[PDB]
PDB file of N, CA and C in Angstrom:
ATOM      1  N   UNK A   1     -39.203 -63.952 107.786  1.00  0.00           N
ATOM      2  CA  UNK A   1     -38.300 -63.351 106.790  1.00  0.00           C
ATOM      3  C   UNK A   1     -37.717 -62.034 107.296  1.00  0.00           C
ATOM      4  N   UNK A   2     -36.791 -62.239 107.034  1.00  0.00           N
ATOM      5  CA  UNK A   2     -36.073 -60.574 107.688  1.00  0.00           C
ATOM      6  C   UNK A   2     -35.897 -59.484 106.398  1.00  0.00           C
ATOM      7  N   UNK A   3     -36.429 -60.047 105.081  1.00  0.00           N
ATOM      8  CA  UNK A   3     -37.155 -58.624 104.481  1.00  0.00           C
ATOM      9  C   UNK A   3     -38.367 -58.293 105.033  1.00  0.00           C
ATOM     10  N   UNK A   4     -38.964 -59.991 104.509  1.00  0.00           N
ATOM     11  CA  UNK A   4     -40.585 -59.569 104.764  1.00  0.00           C
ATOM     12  C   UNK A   4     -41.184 -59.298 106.457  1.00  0.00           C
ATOM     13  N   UNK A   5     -40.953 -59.861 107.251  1.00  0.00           N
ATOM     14  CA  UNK A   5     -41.455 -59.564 108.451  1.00  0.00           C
ATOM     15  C   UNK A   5     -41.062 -61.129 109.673  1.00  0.00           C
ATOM     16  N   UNK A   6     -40.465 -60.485 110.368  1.00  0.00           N
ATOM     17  CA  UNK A   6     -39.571 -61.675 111.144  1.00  0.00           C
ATOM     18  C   UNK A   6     -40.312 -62.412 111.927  1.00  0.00           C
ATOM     19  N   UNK A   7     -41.281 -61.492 112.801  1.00  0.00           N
ATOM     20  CA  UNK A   7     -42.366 -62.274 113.476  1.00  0.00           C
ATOM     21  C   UNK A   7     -43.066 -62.859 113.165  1.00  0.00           C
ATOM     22  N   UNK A   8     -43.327 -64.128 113.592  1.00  0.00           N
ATOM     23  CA  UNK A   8     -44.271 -65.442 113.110  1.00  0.00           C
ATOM     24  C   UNK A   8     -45.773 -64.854 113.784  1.00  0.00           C
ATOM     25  N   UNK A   9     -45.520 -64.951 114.996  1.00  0.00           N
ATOM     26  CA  UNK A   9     -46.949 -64.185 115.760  1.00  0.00           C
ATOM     27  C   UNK A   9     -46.233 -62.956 116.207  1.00  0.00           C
ATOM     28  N   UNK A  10     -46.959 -62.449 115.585  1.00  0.00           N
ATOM     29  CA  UNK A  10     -47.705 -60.428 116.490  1.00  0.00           C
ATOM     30  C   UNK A  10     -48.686 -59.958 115.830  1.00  0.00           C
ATOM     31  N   UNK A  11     -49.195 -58.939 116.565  1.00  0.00           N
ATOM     32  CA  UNK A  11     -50.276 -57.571 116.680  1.00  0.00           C
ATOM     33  C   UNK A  11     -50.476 -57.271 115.806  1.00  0.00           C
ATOM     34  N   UNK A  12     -51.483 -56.265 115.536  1.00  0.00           N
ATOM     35  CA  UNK A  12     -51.428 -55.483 114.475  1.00  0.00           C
ATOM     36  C   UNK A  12     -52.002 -54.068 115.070  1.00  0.00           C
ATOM     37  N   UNK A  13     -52.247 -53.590 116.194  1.00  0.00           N
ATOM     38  CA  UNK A  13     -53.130 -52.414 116.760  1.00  0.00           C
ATOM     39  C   UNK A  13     -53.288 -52.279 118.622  1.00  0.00           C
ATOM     40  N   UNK A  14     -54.167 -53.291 118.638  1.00  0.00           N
ATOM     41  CA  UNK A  14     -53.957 -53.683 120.515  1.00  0.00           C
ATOM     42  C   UNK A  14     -53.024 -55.150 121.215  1.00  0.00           C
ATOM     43  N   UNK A  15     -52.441 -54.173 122.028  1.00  0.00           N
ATOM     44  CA  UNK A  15     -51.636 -54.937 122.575  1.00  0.00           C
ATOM     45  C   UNK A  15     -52.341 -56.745 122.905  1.00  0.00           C
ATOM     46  N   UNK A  16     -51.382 -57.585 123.164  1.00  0.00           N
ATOM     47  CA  UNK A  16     -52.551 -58.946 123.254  1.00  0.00           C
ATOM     48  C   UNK A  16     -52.320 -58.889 125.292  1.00  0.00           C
ATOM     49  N   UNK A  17     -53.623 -58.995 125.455  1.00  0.00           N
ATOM     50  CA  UNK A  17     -53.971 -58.905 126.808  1.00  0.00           C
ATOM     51  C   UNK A  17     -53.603 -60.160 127.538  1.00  0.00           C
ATOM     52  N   UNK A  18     -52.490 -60.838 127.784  1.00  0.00           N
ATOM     53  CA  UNK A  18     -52.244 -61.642 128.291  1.00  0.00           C
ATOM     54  C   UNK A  18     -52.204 -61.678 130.317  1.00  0.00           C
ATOM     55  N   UNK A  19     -53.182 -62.356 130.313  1.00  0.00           N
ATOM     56  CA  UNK A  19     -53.772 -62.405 131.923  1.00  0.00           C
ATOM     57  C   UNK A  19     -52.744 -63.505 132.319  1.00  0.00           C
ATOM     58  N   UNK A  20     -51.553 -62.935 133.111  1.00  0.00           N
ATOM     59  CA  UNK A  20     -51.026 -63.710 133.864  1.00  0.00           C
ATOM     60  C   UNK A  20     -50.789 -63.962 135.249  1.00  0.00           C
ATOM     61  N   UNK A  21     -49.849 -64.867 135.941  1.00  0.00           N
ATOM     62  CA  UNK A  21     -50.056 -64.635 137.528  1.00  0.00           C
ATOM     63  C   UNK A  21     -48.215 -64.555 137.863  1.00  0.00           C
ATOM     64  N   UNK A  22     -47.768 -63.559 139.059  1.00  0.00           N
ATOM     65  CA  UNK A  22     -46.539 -64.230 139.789  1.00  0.00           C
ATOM     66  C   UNK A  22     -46.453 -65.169 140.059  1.00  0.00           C
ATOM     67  N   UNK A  23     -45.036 -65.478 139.759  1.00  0.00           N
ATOM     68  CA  UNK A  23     -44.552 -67.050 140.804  1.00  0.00           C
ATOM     69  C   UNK A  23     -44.474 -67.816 140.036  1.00  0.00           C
ATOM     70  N   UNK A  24     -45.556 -68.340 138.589  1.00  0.00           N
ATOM     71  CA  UNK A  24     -45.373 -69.223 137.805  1.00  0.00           C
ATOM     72  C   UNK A  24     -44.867 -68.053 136.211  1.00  0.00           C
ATOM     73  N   UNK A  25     -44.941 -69.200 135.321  1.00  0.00           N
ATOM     74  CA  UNK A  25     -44.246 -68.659 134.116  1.00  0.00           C
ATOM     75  C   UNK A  25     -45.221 -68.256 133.035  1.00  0.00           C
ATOM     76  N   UNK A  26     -44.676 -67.496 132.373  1.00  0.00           N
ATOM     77  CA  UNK A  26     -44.882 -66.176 131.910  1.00  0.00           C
ATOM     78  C   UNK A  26     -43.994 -66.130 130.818  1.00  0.00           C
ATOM     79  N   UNK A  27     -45.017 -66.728 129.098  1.00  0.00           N
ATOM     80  CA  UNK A  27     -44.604 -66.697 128.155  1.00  0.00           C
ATOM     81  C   UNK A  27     -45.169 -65.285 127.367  1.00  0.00           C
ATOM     82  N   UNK A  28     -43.858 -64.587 126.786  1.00  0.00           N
ATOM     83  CA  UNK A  28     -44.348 -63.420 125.970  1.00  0.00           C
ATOM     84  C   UNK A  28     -44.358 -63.835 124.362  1.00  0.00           C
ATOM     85  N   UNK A  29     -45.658 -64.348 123.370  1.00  0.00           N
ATOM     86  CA  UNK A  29     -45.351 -65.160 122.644  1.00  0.00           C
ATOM     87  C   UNK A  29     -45.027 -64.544 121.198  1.00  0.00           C
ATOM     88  N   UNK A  30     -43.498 -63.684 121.296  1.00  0.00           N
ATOM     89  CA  UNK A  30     -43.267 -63.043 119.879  1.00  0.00           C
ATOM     90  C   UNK A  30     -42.105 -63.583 118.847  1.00  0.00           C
ATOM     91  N   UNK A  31     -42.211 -64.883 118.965  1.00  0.00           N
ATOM     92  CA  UNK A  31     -41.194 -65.349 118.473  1.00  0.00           C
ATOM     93  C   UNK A  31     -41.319 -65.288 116.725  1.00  0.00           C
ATOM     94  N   UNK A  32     -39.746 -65.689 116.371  1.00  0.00           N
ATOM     95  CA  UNK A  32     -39.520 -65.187 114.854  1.00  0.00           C
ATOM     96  C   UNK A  32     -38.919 -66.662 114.699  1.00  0.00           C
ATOM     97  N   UNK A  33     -38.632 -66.501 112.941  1.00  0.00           N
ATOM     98  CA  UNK A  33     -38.259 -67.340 112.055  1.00  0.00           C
ATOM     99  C   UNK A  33     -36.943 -67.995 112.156  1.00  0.00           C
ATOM    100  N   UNK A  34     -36.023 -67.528 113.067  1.00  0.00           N
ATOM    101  CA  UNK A  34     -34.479 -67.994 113.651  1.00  0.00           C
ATOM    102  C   UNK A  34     -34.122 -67.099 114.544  1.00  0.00           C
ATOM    103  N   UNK A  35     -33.255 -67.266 115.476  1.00  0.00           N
ATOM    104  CA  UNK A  35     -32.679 -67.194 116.475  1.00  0.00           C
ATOM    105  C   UNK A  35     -31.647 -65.707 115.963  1.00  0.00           C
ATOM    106  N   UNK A  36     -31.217 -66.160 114.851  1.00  0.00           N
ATOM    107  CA  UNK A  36     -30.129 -65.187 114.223  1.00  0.00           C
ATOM    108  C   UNK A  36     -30.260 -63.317 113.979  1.00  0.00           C
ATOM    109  N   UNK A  37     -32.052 -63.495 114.275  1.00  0.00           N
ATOM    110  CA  UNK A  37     -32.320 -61.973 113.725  1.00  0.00           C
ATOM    111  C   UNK A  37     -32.347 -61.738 114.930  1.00  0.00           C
ATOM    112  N   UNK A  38     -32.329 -62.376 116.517  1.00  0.00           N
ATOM    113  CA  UNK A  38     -32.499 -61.415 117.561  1.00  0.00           C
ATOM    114  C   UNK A  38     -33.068 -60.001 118.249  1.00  0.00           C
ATOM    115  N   UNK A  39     -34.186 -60.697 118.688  1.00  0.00           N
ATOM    116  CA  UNK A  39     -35.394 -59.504 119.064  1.00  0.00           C
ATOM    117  C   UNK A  39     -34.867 -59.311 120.485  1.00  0.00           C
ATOM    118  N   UNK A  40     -35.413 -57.917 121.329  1.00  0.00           N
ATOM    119  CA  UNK A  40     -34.588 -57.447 122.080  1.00  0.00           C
ATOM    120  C   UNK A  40     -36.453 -57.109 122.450  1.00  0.00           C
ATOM    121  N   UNK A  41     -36.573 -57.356 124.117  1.00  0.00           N
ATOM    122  CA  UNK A  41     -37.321 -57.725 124.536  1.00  0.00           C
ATOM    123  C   UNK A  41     -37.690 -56.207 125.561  1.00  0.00           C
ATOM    124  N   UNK A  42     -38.250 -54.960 125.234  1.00  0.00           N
ATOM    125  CA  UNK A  42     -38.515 -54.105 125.712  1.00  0.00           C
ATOM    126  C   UNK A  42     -39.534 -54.138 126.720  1.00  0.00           C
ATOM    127  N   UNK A  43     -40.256 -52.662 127.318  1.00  0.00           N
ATOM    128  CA  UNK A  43     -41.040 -52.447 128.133  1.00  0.00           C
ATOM    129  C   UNK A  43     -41.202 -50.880 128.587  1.00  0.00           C
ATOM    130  N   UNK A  44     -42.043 -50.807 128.532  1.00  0.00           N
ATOM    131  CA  UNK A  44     -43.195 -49.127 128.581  1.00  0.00           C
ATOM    132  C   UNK A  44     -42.387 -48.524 129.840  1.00  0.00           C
ATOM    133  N   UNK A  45     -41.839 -47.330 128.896  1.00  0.00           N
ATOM    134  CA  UNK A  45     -41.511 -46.174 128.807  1.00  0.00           C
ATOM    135  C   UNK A  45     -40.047 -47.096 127.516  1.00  0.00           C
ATOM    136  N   UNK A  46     -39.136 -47.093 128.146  1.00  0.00           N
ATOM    137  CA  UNK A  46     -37.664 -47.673 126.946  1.00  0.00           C
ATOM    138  C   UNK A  46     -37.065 -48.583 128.133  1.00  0.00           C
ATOM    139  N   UNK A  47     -37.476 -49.435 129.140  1.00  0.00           N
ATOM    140  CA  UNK A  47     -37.135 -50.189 129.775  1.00  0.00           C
ATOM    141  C   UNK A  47     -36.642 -51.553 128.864  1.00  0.00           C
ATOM    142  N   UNK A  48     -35.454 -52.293 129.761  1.00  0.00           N
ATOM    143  CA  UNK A  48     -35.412 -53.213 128.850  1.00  0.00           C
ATOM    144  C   UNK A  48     -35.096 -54.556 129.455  1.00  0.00           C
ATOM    145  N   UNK A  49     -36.035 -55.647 129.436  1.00  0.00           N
ATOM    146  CA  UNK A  49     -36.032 -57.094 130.177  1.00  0.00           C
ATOM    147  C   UNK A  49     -34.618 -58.069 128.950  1.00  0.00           C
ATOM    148  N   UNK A  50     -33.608 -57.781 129.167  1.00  0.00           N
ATOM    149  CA  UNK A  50     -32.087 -58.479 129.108  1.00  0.00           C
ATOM    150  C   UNK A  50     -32.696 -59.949 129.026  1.00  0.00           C
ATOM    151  N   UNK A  51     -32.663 -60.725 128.102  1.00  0.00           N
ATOM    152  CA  UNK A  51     -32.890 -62.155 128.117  1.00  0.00           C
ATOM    153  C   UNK A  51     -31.458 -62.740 128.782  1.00  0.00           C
ATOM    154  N   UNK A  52     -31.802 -62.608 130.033  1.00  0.00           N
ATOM    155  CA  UNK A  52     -30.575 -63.448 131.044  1.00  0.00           C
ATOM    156  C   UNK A  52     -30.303 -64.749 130.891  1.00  0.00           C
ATOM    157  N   UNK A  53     -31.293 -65.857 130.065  1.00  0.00           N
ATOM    158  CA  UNK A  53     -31.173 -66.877 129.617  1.00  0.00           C
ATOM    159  C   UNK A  53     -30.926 -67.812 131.616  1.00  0.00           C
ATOM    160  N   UNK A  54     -31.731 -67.490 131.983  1.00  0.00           N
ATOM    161  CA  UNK A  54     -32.147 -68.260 133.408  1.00  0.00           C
ATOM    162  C   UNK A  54     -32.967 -68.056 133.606  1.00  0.00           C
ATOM    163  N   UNK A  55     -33.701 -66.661 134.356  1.00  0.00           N
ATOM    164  CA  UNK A  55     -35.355 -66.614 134.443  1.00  0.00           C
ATOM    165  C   UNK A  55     -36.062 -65.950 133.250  1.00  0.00           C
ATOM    166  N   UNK A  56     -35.855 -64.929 132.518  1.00  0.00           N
ATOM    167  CA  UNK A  56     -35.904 -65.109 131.335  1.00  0.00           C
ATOM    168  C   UNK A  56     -35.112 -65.911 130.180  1.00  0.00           C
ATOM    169  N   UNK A  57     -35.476 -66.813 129.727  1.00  0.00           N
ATOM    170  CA  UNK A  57     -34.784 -67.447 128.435  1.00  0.00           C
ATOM    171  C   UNK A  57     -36.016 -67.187 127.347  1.00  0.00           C
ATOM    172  N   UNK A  58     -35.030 -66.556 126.212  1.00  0.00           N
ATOM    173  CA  UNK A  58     -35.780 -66.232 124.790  1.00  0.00           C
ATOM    174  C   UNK A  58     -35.471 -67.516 123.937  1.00  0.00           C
ATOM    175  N   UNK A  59     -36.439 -68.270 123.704  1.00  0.00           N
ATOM    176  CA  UNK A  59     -37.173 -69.143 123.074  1.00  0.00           C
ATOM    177  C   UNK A  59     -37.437 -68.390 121.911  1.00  0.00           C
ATOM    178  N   UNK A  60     -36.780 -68.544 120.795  1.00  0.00           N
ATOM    179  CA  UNK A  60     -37.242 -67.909 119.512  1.00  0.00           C
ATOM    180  C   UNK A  60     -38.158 -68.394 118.625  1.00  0.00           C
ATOM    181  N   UNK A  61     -38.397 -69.759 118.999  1.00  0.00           N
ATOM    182  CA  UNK A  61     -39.439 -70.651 118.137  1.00  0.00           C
ATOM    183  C   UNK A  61     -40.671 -71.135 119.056  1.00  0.00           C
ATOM    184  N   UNK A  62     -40.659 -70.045 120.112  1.00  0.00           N
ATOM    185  CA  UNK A  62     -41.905 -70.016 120.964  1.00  0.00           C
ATOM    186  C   UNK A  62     -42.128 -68.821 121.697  1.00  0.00           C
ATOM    187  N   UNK A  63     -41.080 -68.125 122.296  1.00  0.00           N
ATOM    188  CA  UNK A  63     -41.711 -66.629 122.965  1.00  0.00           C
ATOM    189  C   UNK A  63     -40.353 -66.156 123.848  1.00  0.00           C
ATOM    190  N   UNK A  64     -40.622 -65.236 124.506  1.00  0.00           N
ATOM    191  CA  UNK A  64     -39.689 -65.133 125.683  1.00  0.00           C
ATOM    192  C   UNK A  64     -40.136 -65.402 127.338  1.00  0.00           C
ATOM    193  N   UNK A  65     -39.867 -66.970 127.565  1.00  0.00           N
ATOM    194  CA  UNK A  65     -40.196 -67.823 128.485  1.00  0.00           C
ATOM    195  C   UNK A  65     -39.318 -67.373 129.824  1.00  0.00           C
ATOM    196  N   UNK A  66     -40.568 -66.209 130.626  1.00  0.00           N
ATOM    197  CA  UNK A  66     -39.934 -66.070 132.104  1.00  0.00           C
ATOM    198  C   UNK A  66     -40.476 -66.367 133.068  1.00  0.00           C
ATOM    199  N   UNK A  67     -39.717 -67.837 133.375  1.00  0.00           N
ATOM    200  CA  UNK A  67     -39.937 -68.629 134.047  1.00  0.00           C
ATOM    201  C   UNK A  67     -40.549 -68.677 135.944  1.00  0.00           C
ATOM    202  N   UNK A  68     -39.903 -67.605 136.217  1.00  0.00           N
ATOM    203  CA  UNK A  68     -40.226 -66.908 137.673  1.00  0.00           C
ATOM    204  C   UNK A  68     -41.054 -65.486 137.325  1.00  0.00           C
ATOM    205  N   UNK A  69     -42.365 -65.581 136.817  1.00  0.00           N
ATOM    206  CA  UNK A  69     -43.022 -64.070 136.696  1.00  0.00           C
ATOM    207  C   UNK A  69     -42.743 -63.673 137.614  1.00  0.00           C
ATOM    208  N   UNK A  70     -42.461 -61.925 137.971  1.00  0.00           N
ATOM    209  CA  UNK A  70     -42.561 -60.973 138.595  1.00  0.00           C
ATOM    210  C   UNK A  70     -43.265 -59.581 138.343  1.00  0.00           C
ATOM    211  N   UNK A  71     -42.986 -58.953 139.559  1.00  0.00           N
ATOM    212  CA  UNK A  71     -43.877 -57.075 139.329  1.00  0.00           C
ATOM    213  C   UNK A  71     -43.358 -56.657 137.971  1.00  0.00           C
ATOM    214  N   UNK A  72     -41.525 -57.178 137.518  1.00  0.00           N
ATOM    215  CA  UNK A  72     -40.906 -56.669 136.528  1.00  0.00           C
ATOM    216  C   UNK A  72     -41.455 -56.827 135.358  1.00  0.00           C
ATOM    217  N   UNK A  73     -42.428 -57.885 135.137  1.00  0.00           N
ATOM    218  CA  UNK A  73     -43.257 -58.236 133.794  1.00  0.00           C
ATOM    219  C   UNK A  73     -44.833 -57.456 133.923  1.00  0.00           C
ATOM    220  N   UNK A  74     -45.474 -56.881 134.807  1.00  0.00           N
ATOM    221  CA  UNK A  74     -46.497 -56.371 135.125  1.00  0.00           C
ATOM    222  C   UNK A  74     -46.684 -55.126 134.310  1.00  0.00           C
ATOM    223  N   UNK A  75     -47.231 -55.103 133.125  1.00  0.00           N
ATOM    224  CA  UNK A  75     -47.279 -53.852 131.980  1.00  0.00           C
ATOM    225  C   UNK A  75     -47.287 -53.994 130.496  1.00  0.00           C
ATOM    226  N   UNK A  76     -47.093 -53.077 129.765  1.00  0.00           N
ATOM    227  CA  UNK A  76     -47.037 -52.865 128.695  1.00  0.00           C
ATOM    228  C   UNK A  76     -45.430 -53.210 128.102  1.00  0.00           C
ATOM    229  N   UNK A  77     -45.764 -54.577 127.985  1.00  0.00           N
ATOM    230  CA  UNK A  77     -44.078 -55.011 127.064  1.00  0.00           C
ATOM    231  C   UNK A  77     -43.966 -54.880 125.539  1.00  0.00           C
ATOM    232  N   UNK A  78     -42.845 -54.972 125.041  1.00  0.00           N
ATOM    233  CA  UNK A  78     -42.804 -54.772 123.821  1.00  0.00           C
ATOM    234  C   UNK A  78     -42.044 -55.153 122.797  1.00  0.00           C
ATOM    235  N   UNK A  79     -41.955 -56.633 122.163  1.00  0.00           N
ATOM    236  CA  UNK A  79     -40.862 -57.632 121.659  1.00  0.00           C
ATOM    237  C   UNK A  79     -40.340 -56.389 120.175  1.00  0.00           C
ATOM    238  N   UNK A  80     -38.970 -55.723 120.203  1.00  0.00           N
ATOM    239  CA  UNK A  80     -39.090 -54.747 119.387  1.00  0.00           C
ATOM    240  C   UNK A  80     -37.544 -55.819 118.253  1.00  0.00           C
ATOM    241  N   UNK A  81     -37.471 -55.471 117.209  1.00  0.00           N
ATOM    242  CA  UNK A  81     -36.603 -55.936 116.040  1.00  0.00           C
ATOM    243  C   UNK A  81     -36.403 -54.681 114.608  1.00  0.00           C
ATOM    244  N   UNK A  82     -34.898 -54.202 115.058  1.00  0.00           N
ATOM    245  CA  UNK A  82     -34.736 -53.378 113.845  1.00  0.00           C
ATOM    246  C   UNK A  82     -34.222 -54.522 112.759  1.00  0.00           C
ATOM    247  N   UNK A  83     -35.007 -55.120 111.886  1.00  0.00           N
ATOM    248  CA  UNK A  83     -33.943 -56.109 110.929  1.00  0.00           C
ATOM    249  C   UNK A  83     -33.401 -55.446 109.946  1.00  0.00           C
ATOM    250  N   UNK A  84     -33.896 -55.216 108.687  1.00  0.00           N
ATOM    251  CA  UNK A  84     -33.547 -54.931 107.334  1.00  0.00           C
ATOM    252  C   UNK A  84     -34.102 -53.357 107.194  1.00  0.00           C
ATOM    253  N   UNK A  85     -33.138 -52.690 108.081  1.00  0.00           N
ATOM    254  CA  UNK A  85     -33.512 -51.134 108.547  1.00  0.00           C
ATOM    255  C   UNK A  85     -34.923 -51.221 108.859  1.00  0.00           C
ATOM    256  N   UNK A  86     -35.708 -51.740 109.284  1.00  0.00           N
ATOM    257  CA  UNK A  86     -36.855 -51.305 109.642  1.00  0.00           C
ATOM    258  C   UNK A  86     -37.539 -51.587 111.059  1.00  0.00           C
ATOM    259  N   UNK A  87     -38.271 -51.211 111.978  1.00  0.00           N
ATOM    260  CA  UNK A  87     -38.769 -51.534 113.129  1.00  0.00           C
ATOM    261  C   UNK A  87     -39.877 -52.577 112.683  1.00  0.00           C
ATOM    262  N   UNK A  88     -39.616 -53.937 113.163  1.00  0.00           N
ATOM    263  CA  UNK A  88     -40.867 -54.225 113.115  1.00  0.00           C
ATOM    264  C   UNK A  88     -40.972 -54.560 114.718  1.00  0.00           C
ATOM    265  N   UNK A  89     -42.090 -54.618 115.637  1.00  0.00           N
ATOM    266  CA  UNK A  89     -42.558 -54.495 117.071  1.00  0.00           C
ATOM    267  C   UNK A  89     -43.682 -55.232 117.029  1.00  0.00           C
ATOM    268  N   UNK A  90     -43.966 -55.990 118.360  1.00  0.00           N
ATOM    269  CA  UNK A  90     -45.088 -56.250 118.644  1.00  0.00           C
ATOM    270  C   UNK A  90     -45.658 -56.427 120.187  1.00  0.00           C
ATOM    271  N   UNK A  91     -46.425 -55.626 120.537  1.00  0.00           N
ATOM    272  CA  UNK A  91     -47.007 -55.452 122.119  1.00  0.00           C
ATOM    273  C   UNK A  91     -47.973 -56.079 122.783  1.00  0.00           C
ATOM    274  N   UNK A  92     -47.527 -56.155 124.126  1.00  0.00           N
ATOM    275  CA  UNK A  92     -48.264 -57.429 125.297  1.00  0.00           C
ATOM    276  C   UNK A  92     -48.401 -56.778 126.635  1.00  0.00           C
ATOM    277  N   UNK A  93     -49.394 -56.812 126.746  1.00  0.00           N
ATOM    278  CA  UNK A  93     -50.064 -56.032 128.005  1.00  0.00           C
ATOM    279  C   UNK A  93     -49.899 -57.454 129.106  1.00  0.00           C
ATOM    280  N   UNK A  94     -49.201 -57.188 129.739  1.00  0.00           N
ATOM    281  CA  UNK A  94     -49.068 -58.713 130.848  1.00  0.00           C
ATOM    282  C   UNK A  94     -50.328 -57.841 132.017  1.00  0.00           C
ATOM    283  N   UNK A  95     -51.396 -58.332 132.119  1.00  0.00           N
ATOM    284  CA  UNK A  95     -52.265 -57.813 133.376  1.00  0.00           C
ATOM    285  C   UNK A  95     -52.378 -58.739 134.398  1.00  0.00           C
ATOM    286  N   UNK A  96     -52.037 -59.135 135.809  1.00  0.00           N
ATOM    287  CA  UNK A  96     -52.318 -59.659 136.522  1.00  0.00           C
ATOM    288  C   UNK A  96     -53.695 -60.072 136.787  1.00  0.00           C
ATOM    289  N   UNK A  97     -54.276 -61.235 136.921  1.00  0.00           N
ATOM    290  CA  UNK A  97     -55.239 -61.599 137.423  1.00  0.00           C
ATOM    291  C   UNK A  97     -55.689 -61.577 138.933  1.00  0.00           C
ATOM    292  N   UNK A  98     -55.323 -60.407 139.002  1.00  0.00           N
ATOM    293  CA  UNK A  98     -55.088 -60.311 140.494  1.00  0.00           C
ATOM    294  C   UNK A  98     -55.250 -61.125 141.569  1.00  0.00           C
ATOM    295  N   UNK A  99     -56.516 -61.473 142.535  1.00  0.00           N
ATOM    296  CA  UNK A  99     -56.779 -62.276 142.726  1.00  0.00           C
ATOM    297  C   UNK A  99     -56.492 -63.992 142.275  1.00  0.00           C
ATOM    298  N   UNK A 100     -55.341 -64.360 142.106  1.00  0.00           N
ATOM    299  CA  UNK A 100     -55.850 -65.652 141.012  1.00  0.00           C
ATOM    300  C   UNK A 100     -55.819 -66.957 142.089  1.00  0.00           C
ATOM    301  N   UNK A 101     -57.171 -67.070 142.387  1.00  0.00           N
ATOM    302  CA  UNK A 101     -57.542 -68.046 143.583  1.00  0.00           C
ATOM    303  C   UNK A 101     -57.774 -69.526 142.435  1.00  0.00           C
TER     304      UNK A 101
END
């Protein structure tokens, strides 16, 4: 709902620790109720991952699906939505599994 709250899944306090790897894909899973309210796909400090709709494509009824992970997803992201004047946000710690043998 874009009174009540657009995001289907998010947070409420700690970021969700999503252990991922380069090279394969790399779903950020903050998707909302339609396509139409358009969430804008941030990152720690005011960085901002542009849904290029090729290696990132935003999937609104599943996440923002980037398909070629990179260093560029490695951090504190942050699916942010001003709808009905209000911020609603929700945060994803992408941590490498470093090693992922």
């Amino acid at each position: 709902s874009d009174t009540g709250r657009p995001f289907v899944e998010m947070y409420s306090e700690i970021p969700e620790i999503i252990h991922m790897t380069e090279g394969r894909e790399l779903v950020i899973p903050c998707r909302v109720t339609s396509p139409n309210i358009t969430v804008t796909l941030k990152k720690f400090p005011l960085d901002t991952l542009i849904p290029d709709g090729k290696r990132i494509i935003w999937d609104s009824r599943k996440g923002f699906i980037i398909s070629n992970a990179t260093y560029k997803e490695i951090g504190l992201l942050t699916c942010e939505a001003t709808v009905n004047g209000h911020l609603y946000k929700t945060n994803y710690l992408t941590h490498r599994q470093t090693n992922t043998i």
